[PDB]
Structure formats: C-alpha cells, structure tokens
Homo-oligomer: 330 residues x 4
C-alpha cells in the first residue's frame, strides 16, 4: 500500500484522513500539526458537519491508534525536520496551505518523502491536476497540486460542454459555503476586507482564479473563462453557476444528455448527474467533485445557457486528493 503522511490537520487534512480509511491502496501512517495526539483524536472522532468517525480511535502513549493502526503524531514547524523516511512515507499530503511553492514543498522530499501533493492551487509553476480533466497528463513529477475545490467542480463540466458544443466564452459564479478562513463576527482580514465580515450574517462577494485555473488543466479553454464567488451562511457544500455561449447550437435536452452520458461513462465517479429536486445538504458527503443539476439550469436560447453543478467542497476534493496520490504512485 502507499504510505501517506499528512501535513496540516485542518478541514481538508481530517477529511482526507477519513476518506482514506476506506481505501485499500493507501494508508495514513503519520500526521503532523501543532496539536497533541489526544486533541487530534478528538477532532477526528467528532465532526459537526460529517458526524462521528465510523471506526475506533484512541491514544496509547503519546501515539494515536486509529482502527487498530498506529499513526505517528509530530509537531514540526519546519517540514525538513519531519523525517518522513523513519515512518516510511511514500507521498505526503501537504494540507497546511503554507507550502504551495516548489522550494517550500521540497522540504518534504528532503525530509525523506518521495512525492508531494498540495491540497490547494500552487502559487508558483508547480503543475496542477484535476481528475476528469488532465490526470493523464501527469509526467512523473515529484511535486504536484490538485488545484482547488471549485476548479475540480468546474473543469469536468466545462470539458463535457466544450468537447460537445464548443465554449466560445463563459462566466461563472460559485455560491460557496463558509470556510475556516472566515470570521464568526466582523473581524480583522487585512488582505480581504469583505472576508472579515460576520460569516453567518452575510452574503459575501469574494474573488476566485478557479475559473481562470481551468485554463491550466484544460489548455483548450485558456482565457475563455473567469468568474467570482459569494460566500454564504452554510457550513458545507457549494454550487457553481456557469453561463456560457456555445459555438454549436444545443437544446437544453441535448446538454443534459451529454452530461449524463459522461457521468455514466468517461467521467463516472467524478461528474455526477441528477434530475431530482435537490438542495445543498443533499450533497453533504458527496464523493463526485461535480454533480450536474438538470432541473436547476436554464437556457435563454440554443447558444446561451446557464448550467448548475454541486460540490461538497470538503469531501469531493479530499477524495480526489487521494485519487491523485494513487495516480502519481502508479
């Protein structure tokens, strides 16, 4: 099995851990964060959003024991001191959001790990990969990025649409759930003022190059998409609203059929499809990174349409982080 180490036990770190427990190809052997093992065990056991951990967890002599397996717990502020090799870590899930450049993420390899997967879009030239879009483009690099949750929702849908009808240009909006970077009440947020305003009280406009980033994993769409977001008072699950002009005329029924076809074929497991009267909570725990909502979209004409797709910003992305780890280890 692939030995994985997790750096950063935040929302993404804890959910990749949970999702990993079902895998048979991967095993989390170590976790690093400024948290004691007993507190780490507590954060794993109880989750406001996803409920109690489905398994056993306990602390035996400064060490965490999940489902019977020992997990090394450390608190190194510098990755280079992690000694991942002592625990035999093959790939490290860099989920701190602090080391998103080659030089910084490199420390993990210097520390004994073979490869690194950033659980966020890279800040430098590090290659990004999105399942359903360009995983096949992996060229053996030892340091990669799984891009962002929104990009993972948008890219798969955009590819289906572009491949079938040709996207001339598109603009998107993501009505996004509240996240850890936000504040409970109006507070300090130096770099993003709107982002400091009370999360549970507001609809908050926010910037995002997730739409632009689609152009990275799908070069054919480079420069044809951009967009923004609105953070709203929900704890989890977001939704993308994509408005596109099509090259080839396509009725709404043809669009639904094309997306349904991909969800049951080439993109099975990544792109989902529904015609039910769903609401956001219906996707809490959703593994697909993009679930097309047939009844929610609306077309003005056969060349100008508004498409809607759901995504559990925590679960979907986390499951694909593991998919990328397994893919670069092949």
């Amino acid at each position: 099995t692939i030995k994985v180490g997790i750096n950063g036990f935040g929302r993404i770190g804890r959910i990749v851990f949970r999702a990993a427990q079902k895998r048979s190809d991967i095993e989390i052997v170590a976790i690093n964060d400024l948290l004691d093992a007993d507190y780490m065990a507590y954060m794993l056991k109880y989750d406001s959003t996803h409920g109690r951990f489905d398994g056993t967890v306990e602390v035996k002599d400064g060490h965490l024991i999940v489902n019977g397996k020992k997990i090394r717990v450390t608190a190194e502020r510098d990755p280079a001191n992690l000694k991942w090799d002592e625990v035999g870590v093959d790939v490290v899930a860099e989920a701190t959001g602090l080391f998103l450049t080659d030089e910084t993420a490199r420390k993990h390899i210097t520390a004994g790990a073979k490869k690194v997967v950033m659980t966020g879009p890279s800040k430098d030239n590090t290659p990004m990969f999105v399942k359903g879009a360009n995983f096949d483009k992996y060229a053996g690099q030892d340091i990669v990025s799984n891009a962002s949750c929104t990009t993972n929702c948008l890219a798969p849908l955009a590819k289906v649409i572009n491949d079938n009808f040709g996207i001339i240009e598109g603009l998107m909006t993501t009505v996004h759930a509240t996240t850890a970077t936000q504040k409970t009440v109006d507070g300090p947020s130096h770099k993003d003022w709107r982002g400091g305003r009370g999360a549970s009280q507001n609809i908050i406009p926010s910037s995002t190059g997730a739409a632009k980033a689609v152009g990275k994993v799908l070069p054919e769409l480079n420069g044809k998409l951009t967009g923004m977001a609105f953070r709203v008072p929900t704890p989890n699950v977001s939704v993308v609203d994509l408005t596109v002009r099509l090259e080839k005329a396509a009725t709404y029924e043809q669009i639904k059929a094309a997306v349904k076809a991909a969800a049951e074929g080439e993109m099975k497991g990544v792109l989902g499809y529904t015609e039910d009267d769903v609401v956001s909570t219906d996707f809490n725990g959703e593994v697909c990174t993009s679930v097309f909502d047939a009844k929610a979209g609306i077309a003005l004409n056969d060349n100008f349409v508004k498409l809607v797709s759901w995504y559990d910003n925590e679960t979907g992305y986390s499951n694909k982080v593991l998919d990328l780890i397994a893919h670069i280890s092949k």
Copy 2:
C-alpha cells in the same frame, strides 16, 4: 394627503407602513388582516430585521394609534366588505398576494377605494410598473402592479446597460434571502418541493420570471433576459448577478462610469452605486431598489461581462410601492 389602506400586514405590508411614516404626501388610515389590533401593534413595534419602530404605537379601544393618528383595524376575508370609503381610502396597497388579478383586486374599488396597487407581479393582464423603467408609461389605470423586488433591482440596471451599450442577451441569478414562504425545517411545499427544505440549512435553487418580466416594463428587452435564483440562509437583502453580452464594446471602467452617471442623474434614488467593500448587511434598510457593486463585477472581455447589484428585498420595494401610489395619484 393621499389616504391609503393596506390589505395584508405581512412583511411587505408592515414595511410599507413603516416607510410611509416618513412621507408627507401619504397617510395610512386603515389596515386589514386577520390579526387583532393589539397583535398588529406588537408586530409593528418589534422587528427582528429592522429593529424597533421609530415612533409611538398603542391600542385605544379596539383601535390602533400610531404616532398619534388613528388607524382603522378590520378583519374582512372578502375585500368587497372593506368599506374603504367610510375611512376615505384613496388608494389601497394590496399586499396579501391573494388578489393579483383584475377581478379579485377590483373588489377594493367596489368597496369604495379609487385605485389599487398590487405589491407583487400581477397574474393576469394588469399593467406592471417599475420606477426608473416605465413609471412614465402610466396611463391612468385604476389597478396596477409594482412587479417584484428582483425585477425592481434588475430593470433599472438593465436599462442603463442596454441604453449605453446594447444588451444582445443576458442571464441572471439572484442569491436571495430567505422569505416567509419558506420553512424552518424540511416541511410540506406541494407546488415547489425544493422550497419546503429547511431554509437555514440550505442553498435552495428556485425559479423566477423576474428576468423575463423586465421585458414587460422595458419592451425593448423583451425576450433577451431570463434567469433563476438561489435562496440562502440570510433574513434579508439579496443580490443579482447579471451576465450579459454587449453589442458595443465597453471596458469595465466605462460600465462603472455609465452606472454611476445614472445613479447621480436620471435614476437618482432608485439606482445606487458603490466602490466600497460591502457585504449584504450593509444594505439592510437600503431605499434604492438597485445598488451597483463596482468592485464585485468582473469582465471576461469588452463584450461579455458579469454585473452585481444589491437590494433590500423588503425596504427597497416597499418604498417604491409608495412611490407608485403617489405617482398614480398625481
């Protein structure tokens, strides 16, 4: 002064009442709803969203006394029995959402009132009017509609954009606050299933012909706009997200200047403009029916842009309901 009677003391009814207290041209003399005067006084005095009533309110012998003036309180299930003439009602604000056709709203005139203003889009052929769009088209009709809150936000913005650059086609989304028609927990909503799902827990897709209705008050745009909505966990204030293709190339700076010009000119008081880092609560109590958010919008190119405009779905609309009443009484 214009004597107005209010039928339906719901959110709209109570807020038009509050906003009317500042007017000098209008006076609310009667209110009709299945609520006792003392309960009516309580709903007026305390408001979770807008705070305590700024004035005096009390019940003196089965009758309500607001700011010193007597208000007739009745509970007629049938408008025809309202005897609006006994209290001298000139115009009636039909805010029950039950009489949105000529025949049904007619009962008010039969009851002694001269004219009727529906606080919602008409269901039949009754003419709709939106301030900043077609108030000048009023042709003395005795029964009119002020259309919907979203249409009041969208129409003014759409006119500025179309007049200046020509809208080829557009699609809009309104991230809308929760309203009285929604449910606190998953409950029965026969005609709109998604709409029955717990409001505070979900992002809820919802239909709306507000975009299409712009084509009514602005015939030049008929058939060029449509859209949908998402109800979210906030108590008040929504926002429109308008994606449009322009006939004439226009940089984002030119778009901002055109909207700012209208907000300070022809559309002063109806269309607002800001370049600040605003969030939804910053518009709780907003009188303008559409406040352009300069920093939130984003353009892909000079002919494909996404525009953002805020609106207090309760306050803005209510203030324009009174504006229409004053306009048809001129």
Copy 3:
C-alpha cells in the same frame, strides 16, 4: 411482526418511519397524509438533517415501495375513513398533533386499528408513558401517549437523581432547536407571539409543561418540578439544564457515578452518559432519549446542583415511540 400505520408524515412521522426500518418486530404498512406518494417518497429520500435514506424507495402505480415492501398511501382528512383493517394495521402512530384526545384518537380504532399511540402529550386524560420511567405501568389501554421529547429527556434523569439523592425541588430550562411550528421571518403566531419571530435570528423564550409532566409518569415528583425553554437557531438537537436541591448531600462525583451506573444498567439504551467535550451536533442521530454531559454540569454545593443532558428531539423520541408500540403490543 406488528403492523403499524402512520398518520401524519411530518418530522416525527418520517423519522419514526426511518427508525422503524431497522426494527424486526415492527413494519410500517401504511401512511396517511395530504401528500401524493411521489412527494412522500421525495421527503423520505432526502433529509436536510439526517441525510439520504439508507435504502430503496420508489413509486409503483400510485403506491410507495420502500426497501421492497409495499406501503399504502392515503389522504383521508377524517381518521374514521382510514380503513386500517383493510391493510391489517395493529397499532397506529398518531403523529398529526390534531387528535390528542380519546374521542378524536378513537376514530382510528373505529377505523379498524387495535391501538393508538399519540406522538405528543395528550390533551385530555389519556395515559402518558416514558421509557425508563413508567413503561411498566402500562395497563393494557388501547390509546396511549408517549408524552413529549423534553419529558423523555428529563424524566429518566430526574428518576436517577431522585431515587439516589431525593429531589426536594427543581427548575429546568431546555435550550431547544428550532421546529416546524416556528417561522423563517417575523410572521403570524396568534397563540404564541414570541413564537412567530424569525427563528434563525433569535433566542426565543417559550413555555413548556414538560417539567410539570414528569409528575405524571413519575408521581413521586408531582409538583416538584417546572420550567421553561429557549428556542435557538439550530435545526436539531436540544439540551436540558436542570437545577435541583437535593435532600441527601451528594458530591458531583457521586452524581456522575449514579447516572453512569443507570446508563449501563436499568436505563441502558434510554439514558446515556459522556465525559467528552461534546457539542450539540455530536448527538444528531442519537437514539438515547437523554445523554448526561458530565463535564458540563456544575455544583454550588453538595445539595444544590445544575445538571446537563442532551437529546436529539427528532431521533430519540421517535425511537421510543416505536418502543412504546412494541411494549403495548406485548
């Protein structure tokens, strides 16, 4: 197996249905409510609070098919016309909140059912039963009540405390989750004004004789307890805060040991016990009707203490509704 019919497919009705699927002694064969079978299937399949139904559900010719079994779906406004005997209903779960008196609930027996269980406190003299308190007092009555969710949380705890140390007197408060009877925004609530105020915006004081009702299922405490509640902006799970004066001095450690003993003994399955840093969501789906929070309580002295106990107002109660059905069918 015991054939059960459910009248009222509200929150309680749908959750008793879900919980029943795990039982082997009971089978839901019919459901009655003013909802079509396809809408009924939708409400069962998607739940904002408890997630998707763990099983199969579909509509085959005006009839619902859950997990392979056929469920009769009707829409009788009058229970007498239900013909429960045609479907062989043994016991009916009266969950409409409309028939809480013997005469009204009787119609079910007149309709062919053998016994009735009200999923709410009876309004007349009908006997109430709470598991862990007086199920053993059942005297073969054909119509019974399972009392209320709060009473089911309070009674078990009160019994342990009284039996061990003697309750001289107590006052309780339940910080209660929002329910279906509340409003999304300030709306009409004739009989309970505070209750009409926007649920997601307020802490709302509310009356409750749940504390007094403990005196019914536990006559030894009659007249020694009373209390009130506060409805807060959460979708599910409440908590009781019980302040009591004890006859016999008891340290806090002795209190915890006494409650822990009962949770693992006589009250196993009804009364739970924890010493973890739990929060409300940690009990979403909780089957025990009362989970003592050891670390949350606080004693002033050995004879004046404040005890805390959690309860999933939907799940716990629903599971005990089925427990009562199985008990009166023995």
Copy 4:
C-alpha cells in the same frame, strides 16, 4: 472633556467608540491597533450587527477624521511606546484582552496616560467595578476593570433580589451569542475544545466565572452564586437564566414589582424592565446592561424561582465602560 485612548479596535473597541460619539464628557482622541487608518475607517463605517456609522468618517493623510475630529492612529505592539501624553490621553480603554494585570496595563501609565480601564475581568488583583453594584466603592485607583458583560447583567439583578428577599444560593446559565473567539467551522481551540466547534452549527457548553465574580463587586453574595453558559448561533445579544432560593417568601408579582421599582429608581439606566413578548433581537442596541423579562421567568414556589434578564453583550457593556471612565475621572 475626558481624553480617551482606545487600545484594541475589536468588537468592544469599535462599539465603545461608537457609543462615545454621543457623550459630551468624553472624546476619543487616539486608537491603537495593527490596522491601517483606512481599514480602521472601514470597520467603523460598516457593521453587520449595528448597521452603518451614524456620522462622517474619512482618512486625511494617514490620519482618521471622525465627525470632524482628528483621531491619532498608531500600531504599537508594546503599550509603553504609545506616548499617550503626546495626544493628551487622560484615560485609556484597554480593550485588547492582552493586558489584564497591573504590570501589563501599567505600561499605559508609563506611556503618559493617567488611568486605565480594562474592558474585561482582571486576571490579577486589580479591582473590578460594575455599575449598579459598586461604582460607589471606587477608591481613586489608577487601574480598574469593568468586569465582564455577563457579570454586568447578573450583578444588578442579583442585588435587587438579594436586598429585597435574600439570596440563599443561586445557579445561573447564560444562553450567549457567538463571539470573535469562536470558529466558523470545526477548528483549533487548544485551551477550550468545545469552543473550536463550528459556531453556526452548534449549541456549545462553555465555562464562565461571571457568576462567581458577582461575589467580588457584591461581597455579600460571595460564594453564593456560580454557573455556566451555552454559546448559540446568534451574532449578538445574550440572556441570563437565574435560579435562586430565597430567604424570604416572595410571590412572582412581588419579584416583578421589586425589579420594576429599581429599574425606575436607583438602577435607572442600568437595569431595565419589560412585560412584552420580547425576543433577543429586540435588544440589539440596548444600553441597559440588564433587562428583566417579566413574562419569561417562572416560580415553582415562593422561595424557589427562575429569573430571566437580557443583555446586548456588545452595546450594554461598552456604554458602561464609558460610564466607569467618566466615574473614575470625577
């Protein structure tokens, strides 16, 4: 006028500033925090909870200008470097929560200020004062504490009750609004695990010696009161639930009359009284630090009663912080 400097522009700092604008005896001349003047101006102008600033605010050459007066803006990490004397600061409102001991708060005096008022309970021996309880006990100390919001709500009520009927012992609970120290989603909170759980999703048990602290400002009650709290999903306004055993028998009507008397007499302006069907939002902006809710309380008998009192944890306390400043400057 009294020249005041504010250290810490958090919720308390910004609200004391707003409330100060109405005072004629005090003037804020300087503010210190790690925030630029333009961002400081933004936080002052827009408030999710209390709406837009009622006045003028702008930045003229690195300096803030509020309502026409110049305000010095600095960013010293060490109070000793503040040079309060250069701006002529008489009293400093220490609102960072970092300097709650004499030695640390002393730096302000060393920096040129005459006296210091901690906007939080002192961690050392520094004297605490609560308006309505012991302001008259001020003995000219140069460094004082205004204790906590909850203590300011509880103490005034407790005094009225004790003085009139004699409190043998009491236990209290405060259903408290979410604050800045909490998290938007399950996050790290080393010293208080429950406190790290998603604020908008949970009812969160929390410790508090506010009840015990009443014994400091009212020595006659020392050791007779204690309690705890529950943080809930509301942005502002909390409520205390006080259960007390009385020495002298007192009907509920006698209790209401005693509290009403104090609210209109000795405690006018600090202790409020109502018999209306109020909800939490009805006190957003409330200046009294304790508003007795007559209809919400409930008595078991004439010697065991549960009393309820509201408080805007932001506004009330802030107004009394200024009251203490004015009192120690007399």
